Design a protein around this ligand. Structure first.
Ligand SMILES: CCCCCCC(=O)O
Ligand code: NA
Lengths: 166, 166
């Protein structure tokens, strides 16, 4: 639960986000970035920077929209974290969910087991902290918004998860 | 609790080790491999293979001697794990300790924060599982055996840890 790459370590611009989530949060929404893939701590720190740059500079958002990002390096990158409302699943789901995004496009490829392990351990951590309900529900991005996110291959994997609910 | 690269994923030779540790284990001994470092899941899986090869083929040991290895990629590699007696700290400490080894030489270098985080969260996981006592003690390799292990720079860092006792 303490094995998250913190904001400063991936050279994140400072957050301007103020809106808080109400703990414990019932929902996890799993997205993909549909961005470049990365499989080294060096390449994934850069990728998290690029995603945040797009969201802050181009979209004018207070921070990277996701609560956490997942690298194919098997590390979790701190986004808005447990306590700050994300921008990842639209205005109905953002206030009542944690958004975790796998960095890449998983339409025609899977994240490696280390990426999946990182995500599953992140969610266990959320329960332990009281950030997530013990009985949290995992949704695919496409289950709550019109998108291919989180990609067909990754979507089929999260459908098998104990906490998945269509 | 927590995330770990399992034996099969780093292509480990099958273990022949049978001798069990008595849970909960009171002591953690921190070593270095004094070997080549690695900072990618690909390079660290190979490094764990190389360390195990040395221990099994050359030293004739039943498995890699460490209970867990720590990569500069920020991942933990499963060694003998929580339940099997290691070969890392000699015949007095092996039966009463978990041996975790940072892959590299930390005489004139520190492990990156992600490596240190991985190790600290591995130990929290051990407590959560009942593998380690809640009041476990961290020892440097050099505190229980005549060696420079775990290297001057890493030794100075583990001296600052909550559970460290010389
Ligand atoms: C606040 C909860 C921390 C629990 C300790 C085990 C963990 O690393 O998740
Ligand atoms: Na002491």
């Amino acid at each position: 639960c303490g094995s998250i790459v913190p904001r400063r370590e991936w050279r994140a611009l400072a957050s301007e986000c103020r809106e808080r989530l109400t703990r414990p949060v019932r929902y996890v929404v799993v997205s993909h970035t549909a961005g470049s893939h990365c499989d080294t701590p060096a390449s994934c720190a850069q990728q998290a920077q690029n995603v945040q740059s797009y969201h802050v500079r181009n979209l004018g958002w207070c921070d990277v929209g996701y609560n956490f990002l997942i690298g194919e390096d098997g590390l979790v990158y701190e986004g808005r974290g447990w306590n700050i409302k994300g921008a990842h699943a639209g205005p109905t789901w953002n206030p009542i969910s944690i958004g975790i995004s796998f960095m890449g496009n998983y339409m025609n490829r899977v994240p490696p087991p280390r990426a999946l392990r990182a995500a599953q351990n992140l969610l266990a951590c959320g329960v332990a902290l009281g950030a997530l309900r013990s009985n949290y529900e995992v949704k695919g991005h496409r289950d709550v918004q019109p998108t291919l996110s989180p990609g067909d291959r990754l979507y089929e994997i999260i459908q098998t998860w104990s906490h998945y609910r269509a």
